[PDB]
């Protein structure tokens, strides 16, 4: 069964980050990615 | 902030609650 549906807004994915005293994160590897920007 | 024949005021897509959450 397929039809029109109505849903509330997807505000986005929920990300859990934990602020901690004296704790740090540093990236180990890295990734290189190219993105398209279009200006008329 | 103090707010304010065929003329209808369309509500914004982004509600105040979702803007505050952003
Ligand atoms: C970094 O990522 C690449 C893939 O993008 C992977 O091939 C490479 O092994 C990674 N480097 C390390 C040290 O894991």
b/e B1-22 (16+ beta carbons within 10 angstroms → b): eeeeeeeeeeeeeeeeeeeeee
Angle A11-A12-A14 (CA atoms, 0-180°, nearest 5)? 115
Q: Give the integer Cα–Cα distance in Å for B14 and A8.
A: 11
Instruction: Report the candidate in B21, B16, B13 with the shortest Cα–Cα distance to residue A9.
Output: B13
Q: Give the integer Cα–Cα distance in Å for B19 and A9.
A: 11
The technique by which this structure was obtained is cryo-EM
Q: What is the DSSP string of A2-15?
A: --------------
Chain A CB within 8 Å of residue B21 CB:
yes
Within 8 A of A11 by CB-CB distance, chain B residues are 18, 21-22
Q: Whose CA is nearest to atom 8 of ligand 1?
A: A29
Chain B CB within 8 Å of residue A9 CB:
yes
Q: How many CB atoms lie within 10 A of CB A33?
A: 4
Q: Output the furthest CA–CA distance in chain B (Å, rounded).
A: 36
């Amino acid at each position: 069964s397929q039809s029109i549906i109505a849903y509330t807004m997807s505000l986005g994915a929920e990300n859990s980050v934990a602020y901690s005293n004296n704790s740090i994160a540093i990236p180990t590897n890295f990734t290189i990615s190219v993105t398209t920007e279009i200006l008329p | 902030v103090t707010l304010a024949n065929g003329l209808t005021v369309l509500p914004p897509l982004l509600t105040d609650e979702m803007i505050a959450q952003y």
